[PDB]
Design a protein around this ligand. Structure first.
Ligand SMILES: CC[C@]1(c2cccc(-c3c(F)cncc3OC)c2)C2=C(Nc3n[nH]cc31)[C@H](F)C(C)(C)CC2O
Lengths: 18, 334
């Protein structure tokens, strides 16, 4: 829910496919 | 059972009932008349109107499921029972049958069904109703006449400028990216995004964005469209503009669909599956797309030696949404 938290999960998931 | 006529107020007795849906948000049955009827039961607060009932009363379109009657039951507690027109099949079941058979849905059926979806969205948005649950399971289809009807208006809401609305809405595979980003000021263009996902699913034989969570749903979109730019994020949720997201290259649109997928079908998909909601095609604009040019040709018929369903019987209200597209929507003939 927290944008800081959500962005970090999105970043970490996005780097796992990069 | 005494029930009020759907479309003025108003004696009903039904047979052959069966439970075909359970869980929260209500329970769904089927009934007989000598016709076929659907029943949906929800718990209703006696102090407020039922949102879906008022939505269903307001609408009248050939591509919208018909509200035949409605009646109340106590249970002890008030339960609203919606008497709905029965349609033998859903788009989900037809698509699942083709995939289970390891076959591709013929593009004409995809053309016929998608046009009626976009037409229905044009109508409901004109009446100020956002479906918010556009998915193949909610698309009724007749196997023979190939008419499509939109149903399950339980999630439907009139989005008023300035009123916050729930972000966690729609089924996940068809949820617009701005909803995943937690936007509360979203508009009815989320229905267009879900319609784009339905179209891509019919061409691909599988969902285009198969997320297993909210985060990975946005990952699945990025793997196709690429990482949205900071400006695209600003129109979705400006709270996310200043994060540095990894830049994923967009998979070429021609490389995500099968070899024999029509070029214009891919073009329509790219025009609806846009990060910026204002860049998505209006539902009438999608109807005017060249991908549906076959349905307007003089002589096109259904594969099962039957005529095309009603597709051009636009009402005066329908003719008034976007006047410029009406040259395409109604061909020279008719
Ligand atoms: C009876 C419901 C269906 C339907 C399909 C999808 C959603 C809803 C629905 C709704 F309309 C209102 N609220 C909740 C709902 O589901 C959560 C209703 C129904 C048939 N036919 C229908 N005619 N009218 C509505 C429907 C199809 F033929 C089946 C039997 C193959 C599958 C089926 O379930």
């Amino acid at each position: 829910l927290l944008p800081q938290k959500f962005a970090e999960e999105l970043i970490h998931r996005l780097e796992a496919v990069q | 059972v005494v029930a009020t006529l759907g479309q003025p107020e108003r004696e009903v007795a039904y047979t052959d009932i069966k439970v075909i849906g359970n869980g929260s948000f209500g329970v769904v049955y089927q009934a007989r008349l000598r016709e076929l009827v659907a029943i949906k039961k929800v718990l209703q607060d006696k102090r407020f109107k039922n949102r879906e009932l008022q939505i269903m009363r307001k609408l009248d379109h050939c591509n919208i499921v018909r509200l035949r009657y409605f009646f109340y039951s106590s249970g002890e507690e008030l339960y609203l029972n919606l008497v709905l027109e029965y349609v033998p099949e859903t788009v989900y079941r037809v698509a699942r049958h083709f995939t289970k058979a390891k076959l591709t849905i013929p593009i004409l059926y995809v053309k016929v069904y998608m046009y009626q979806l976009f037409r229905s969205l044009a109508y409901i948005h004109s009446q100020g109703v956002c479906h918010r649950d556009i998915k193949p399971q909610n698309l009724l289809v007749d196997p023979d006449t190939a008419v499509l009807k939109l149903c399950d208006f339980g999630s439907a809401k009139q989005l008023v400028r300035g009123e916050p609305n729930v972000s966690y809405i729609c089924s996940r595979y068809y949820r617009a990216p701005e909803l995943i980003f937690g936007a509360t000021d979203y508009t009815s263009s989320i229905d267009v995004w879900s319609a784009g996902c339905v179209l891509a699913e019919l061409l691909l034989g599988q969902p285009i964005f198969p997320g297993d969570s909210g985060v990975d749903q946005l990952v699945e979109i990025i793997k196709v469209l690429g990482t949205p730019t900071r400006e695209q994020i600003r129109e979705m949720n400006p709270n996310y503009t200043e994060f540095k997201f990894p830049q994923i290259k967009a998979h070429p649109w021609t490389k995500v669909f099968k070899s024999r997928t029509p070029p214009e079908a891919i073009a329509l998909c790219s025009s609806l599956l846009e990060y910026t909601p204002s860049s998505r095609l209006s539902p009438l604009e999608a109807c005017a797309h060249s991908f549906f040019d076959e349905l307007r040709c003089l002589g096109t018929q259904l594969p099962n030696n039957r005529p095309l369903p009603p597709l051009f019987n636009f009402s005066a209200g329908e003719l008034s949404i976007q006047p410029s597209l009406n040259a395409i929507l109604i061909p020279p003939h008719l």
